């Protein structure tokens, strides 16, 4: 999910980081103040 700010937008992840990503979802955010593509393609 990457709309925009993800954070509370396109960015439901159990709150994560900042462009962090994991590995299967991708937090890069938390939700809320965000600006991170929690998806890389």
Partial sequence: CTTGPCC??????PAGTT???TSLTSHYCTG??????????
């Fill in 19 to 21: 462009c962090w990503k």
């Fill in 32 to 41: 809320k103040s965000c600006d991170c593509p929690l998806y890389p393609g």
């Fill in 8 to 13: 509370r937008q396109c960015k439901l992840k």
